[PDB]
């Protein structure tokens, strides 16, 4: 299938070269697989999603996205015209507040949460969380990652954007999952990006178009838009059957495209996520 006029990433992830912009991908989309969003919500009336979102669980008094980041990388996940994987159900875990902000211990429920509500659940496919969010290093937001990649959920997470090593950083340091850092239209890193020997790929994260609550679209920045570029490359693969939750982020790293990318510091993998994707 061939989406003319993609934003860049979603070219980017189907291209052996920057500068093109259809993206091109196996029709199957990601159905029969699950991807959480566990963020500041999505809004799952939005037109874009078509259906396929919806709300979980919250920690606040609503489940409503008041902020408009946690629609944005749900966007990106499987959003009709922004997603990677179009087909693909959304799932919200509201763990951020309207401002963005969330405490450890909740983002903590929030993990854990995914790890048992999967069981709830239809994903035949197989299951992704993608986490655009951290703060510092913390051993228990650590383990809540590995415990949820352990329970068989593919997790992907942000590298951060502190233009640092993430080894600094929760639940980007965890190894046992994925971190994402960032590039953008021109195969640089990011500006922002943090990066290190733990990051395991990289995904477009500057001026990324996806959706926005109130019914809207707009570009923003982050390794927040790197990482669900990556999760819904995993469901997508996952629901082809090239790869399950448990080694989707080896393989992404075994079928990247490779030294690619520029400002990549000495000892930072350099692979940019892509599907690989032959008619
Ligand atoms: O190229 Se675009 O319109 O920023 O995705
Ligand atoms: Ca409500
Ligand atoms: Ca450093
Ligand atoms: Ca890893
Ligand atoms: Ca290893």
Request: charged share 15%.
């Amino acid at each position: 299938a061939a989406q003319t006029n993609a934003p860049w990433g979603l070219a980017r992830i189907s291209s052996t070269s920057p500068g093109t912009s259809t993206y091109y991908y196996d029709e199957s989309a990601g159905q029969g697989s699950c991807v959480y969003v566990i963020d500041t919500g999505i809004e799952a009336s939005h037109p874009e999603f078509e259906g396929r979102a919806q709300m979980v669980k919250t920690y606040y008094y609503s489940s409503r996205d008041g902020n408009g980041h946690g629609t944005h990388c749900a966007g990106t996940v499987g959003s009709r015209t922004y997603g990677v994987a179009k087909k693909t159900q959304l799932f919200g875990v509201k763990v951020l507040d309207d401002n963005g902000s969330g405490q450890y211990s909740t983002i903590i429920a929030g993990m854990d949460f995914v790890a048992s509500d999967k069981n709830n659940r239809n994903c035949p496919k197989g299951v992704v969380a993608s986490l655009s969010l951290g703060g510092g290093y913390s051993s228990s937001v650590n383990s809540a990652a590995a415990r949820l990649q352990s329970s068989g959920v593919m997790v992907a997470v942000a590298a951060g954007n502190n233009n640092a090593d993430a080894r600094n950083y929760s639940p980007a340091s965890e190894p046992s999952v994925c971190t994402v850092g960032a590039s953008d239209r021109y195969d640089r890193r990011s500006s922002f990006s943090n990066y290190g020997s733990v990051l395991d790929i990289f995904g477009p994260g500057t001026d990324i178009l996806s959706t926005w609550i109130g019914g809207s679209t707009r570009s923003i920045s982050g390794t927040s838009m790197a990482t669900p570029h990556v999760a819904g490359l995993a469901a997508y693969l996952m629901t082809l059957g090239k790869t399950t939750a448990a080694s989707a982020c080896r393989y992404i790293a075994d079928t990247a495209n490779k030294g690619d990318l520029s400002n990549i510091p000495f000892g930072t993998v350099n692979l940019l996520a892509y599907n690989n994707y032959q008619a």
